[PDB]
Write a protein that binds this ligand. Structure first.
Ligand SMILES: [Zn+2]
Ligand SMILES: [Zn+2]
Lengths: 376, 376
C-alpha cells in the first residue's frame, strides 16, 4: 500500500508567443504596476521592452541587479524597488536565478525585514506575497513550478534554500520563443538538467505515480529533441518539445525530490565550475547502471516505457546523448588529486543521496570518482 | 505549435485509512463545524459516525437527503442546513452524487438564491464558497478533482451541469478502504468510467501532454486490476490500484473533456437506465476502431504505450474486459424500435461529441446503434 500527497498549485500557460499574455493575467487578477525581474540580457535584446509594451502599462518597473547566483542583498534591493514603485505583482523572466529572486522578493517586500532573517535561520517565511508570474527562459530548471528559492549570503559565505508555500508562482507562462537564443552549450546543460530531474524523480524513494507519469513523458522527449535543439537552435519544434519536457519534468521531481546525481552535482559545480545540468549528467548513466534492477524492476519498466530495450540500453543512450551534445563524460582533464577525490566523496553525501533506490556507500562514491578521474 | 492551459488546484491525499485525516485538514485550515454530505448507506453502516468521531468535533452535521441523481431542491435543502448550523466547510463522502451536491451547496449557501437560478440559465455562479473536502467512495467518477456539478431539476425536467471554479475541492482524500464495500456490478461500471475517461481524455481534440501522461497511466491500471476488483472485492491491492487509476484519470479528462462515448452515454443512462460507466463502455471499443488512426498515429502510439500491439488489439481487450466483468456489450434485450434508435442518434449529438478526433456523423451513429440494437 502506497501513501502520497500531491499538490501542484501553479497554473501553466504553454505556448509559442504567450509571453505577451502578461496583460491578460494582470487584468484577470485586477493588479497594476508589475515589476519585471530579468537579467540585463533581455533588456539589451529588447525582449523586456517588447513584453512591457505588450502589457499596455500592466508592468511599470524593471529590476536587473542580481547575479547568476542570487544574493540576499539583491533580493532586498529588489524588495525596496517594489515598495518605492508600489508594485502589485512580480514577473520573473529568466532562468532559475531570476525566479529565485522573484519568489523571495514578492514575500519580503510586504515586510520591513531582510530576507536574511529567514535564510537558513529556521524561521518560517510570512505567507502573504505579491502574485508571481514566472516566464522561464531556459529548458530548463523547472523552477517555475517549485516553491523553493536558493540564495547565497556572500558576506556570510552561506548558500541555502528557502521553502515557502508563498513562493509558488501563480501562473507559469512557458513560451518556447524565449529559449530560441540559448546557446548550444547552455541548451545542452539545461537539457541534461531536465533529463536528470525526470529520471531521478522517477526512481527516487519518494516516487509517486503522478510524478512517475510526468517523468516518463519528459525523459522520452529529451532523448529525441535535445540533440536537435543543440544542433539547430532555431528549430521551433525541438525548442517547443524541450520546453514541454522541462516544465513536465519540473512537475516530476518537485515532490519525490532528486537523488544521487543531484547530490554529486553540487561539489562538481561549486568546486570545479561544471554547470549544474552537465554535472548531473556526468553521473546519470553511472547511477542508472547501479540502479538497473532496483525496486523489483521499476527502472527496467521505465526504460522500456520510454522506448529502450532495458536500463543498459537507456544508459548507453544517455552516454551517446552526452557525447553528441558536448557534455562531459569524464574528469581526466581536471588532473584531480587524491585529496580532491576525497573532497568529492565527502561533500557528495548530501541528504538527496539517500533518495537513491540503491544504497550509495562511501566506497561506491570513491570508486565512481576514481573512475571519472581517469576517464576522458 | 501546441497551445494549452493546465490548472489542477486540488490537493490529493492518497492512502489506505487516510479518511481519518479530516480533522488534520480542518485544523490546518482553522475551520470548525463541518457538514458531511453522504448517502444514507454510510450512516447505516456506521462508517460516517466512525469518521465523524475520529474528527474530534471537526464535523458537527450530517446531510443524507439527496438522490442518486441529485436535485436542485436537495442542494437547496443542504444549503439551508449549512446556514442553520453555521457550517464552515463541507466533507463530500460518496460517489458522484454526494460530490455534486456538496460543490453546489458550498457556494449557494452564501447567497439567498436557489441553485436553480444558476442551472443552465447562462448566469455564472458566485465564486465565494465553503472549502470542500472530497472523499470518493467509488473508483470512480473522478469528481473529486473536477469543478463540475451535474444536477437535475425534476420540476422543470432539466438535467444539466454547472461549471464553476469555486466547485474545485480544496483537498481530495482518496482512501481505497472506502471502496471495499462497492458491490461487483457497481465496481465494474465505475471502473469502465475510469477507462473511458482515460482513453477519451487522451484522444480528445483538447488533448494536452500532462493529461496524456495521466491517461496512459490510468488506462494501463484498469486493464490489469479491474477484473480483480470485480472478482475479489476485498483484494486490497486491486482496490488501491483502481483508486489510483480513478483519481489520475480524473486528472486526465477534466481539462481535455470527454468525447463520443460520454456523449452517447447520456441518453443510454437517462432514457434506458444504464449506469454511466457501463453506458460509456458500451461504445468505447466501437469508437476506438473509428478513431484508431486519427491525429497522425497518436492513438496507435497510446495503445502500444500501454502494452497492446495496436488500437484494434486494445479494442479487443476492451471487449474482453466487458465480457469478463459483466458489462453490456449490446442492447438487443431492450427490443429497441426504429424510433428509439433514432432518439439515441439524435440525442447523442451532445457538445462532447465534437471533441472526438474523427467527425461522428449521424449516419455513423445510426450504423452504431443499429449494430448495438442487434447485439447481445
Ligand atoms: Zn537540477
Ligand atoms: Zn464519466
Amino acid at each position: 500500500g502506497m501513501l502520497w500527497d500531491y499538490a501542484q498549485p501553479v497554473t501553466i500557460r504553454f505556448g509559442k508567443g504567450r509571453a505577451m499574455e502578461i496583460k491578460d493575467i494582470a487584468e484577470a487578477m485586477g493588479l497594476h504596476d508589475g515589476i519585471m525581474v530579468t537579467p540585463k540580457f533581455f533588456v539589451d535584446s529588447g525582449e523586456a521592452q517588447r513584453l512591457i509594451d505588450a502589457s499596455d502599462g500592466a508592468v511599470s518597473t524593471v529590476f536587473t541587479d542580481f547575479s547568476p547566483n542570487p544574493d540576499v542583498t539583491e533580493v532586498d534591493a529588489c524588495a525596496e524597488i517594489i515598495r518605492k514603485n508600489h508594485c502589485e505583482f512580480v514577473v520573473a523572466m529568466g532562468g532559475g536565478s531570476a525566479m529565485d529572486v522573484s519568489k523571495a522578493a514578492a514575500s519580503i517586500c510586504l515586510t520591513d525585514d531582510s530576507i536574511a532573517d529567514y535564510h537558513g535561520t529556521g524561521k518560517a517565511m510570512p505567507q502573504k506575497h505579491l502574485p508571481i508570474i514566472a516566464l522561464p527562459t531556459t529548458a530548463g530548471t523547472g523552477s517555475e513550478v517549485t516553491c523553493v528559492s536558493v540564495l547565497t549570503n556572500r558576506k556570510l559565505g552561506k548558500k541555502a534554500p528557502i521553502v515557502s508555500d508563498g513562493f509558488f508562482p501563480s501562473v507559469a507562462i512557458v513560451d518556447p520563443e524565449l529559449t530560441y537564443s540559448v546557446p548550444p552549450k547552455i541548451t545542452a546543460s539545461t537539457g541534461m538538467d531536465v533529463l536528470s530531474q525526470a529520471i531521478e524523480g522517477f526512481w527516487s524513494k519518494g516516487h509517486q505515480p503522478i510524478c512517475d507519469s510526468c517523468a516518463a513523458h519528459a525523459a522520452k522527449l529529451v532523448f529525441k529533441y535535445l540533440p536537435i535543439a543543440v544542433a539547430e537552435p532555431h528549430n521551433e519544434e525541438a525548442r517547443e518539445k524541450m520546453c514541454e519536457a522541462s516544465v513536465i519534468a519540473g512537475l516530476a521531481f518537485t515532490l519525490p525530490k532528486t537523488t544521487s546525481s543531484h547530490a554529486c552535482s553540487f561539489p562538481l559545480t561549486n568546486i570545479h565550475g561544471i554547470p549544474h545540468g552537465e554535472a548531473c549528467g556526468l553521473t546519470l548513466d553511472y547511477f542508472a547502471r547501479i540502479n538497473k534492477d532496483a525496486q523489483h524492476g521499476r527502472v527496467q519498466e521505465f526504460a522500456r516505457g520510454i522506448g529502450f530495450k532495458d536500463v543498459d540500453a537507456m544508459a548507453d543512450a544517455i552516454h551517446d546523448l552526452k557525447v553528441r551534445i558536448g557534455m562531459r563524460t569524464g574528469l581526466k582533464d581536471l588532473n584531480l588529486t587524491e585529496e580532491q577525490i576525497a573532497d568529492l566523496v565527502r561533500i557528495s553525501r548530501h541528504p538527496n543521496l539517500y533518495n537513491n533506490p540503491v544504497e550509495i556507500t562511501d566506497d561506491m562514491l570513491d570508486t565512481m570518482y576514481h573512475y571519472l578521474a581517469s576517464t576522458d
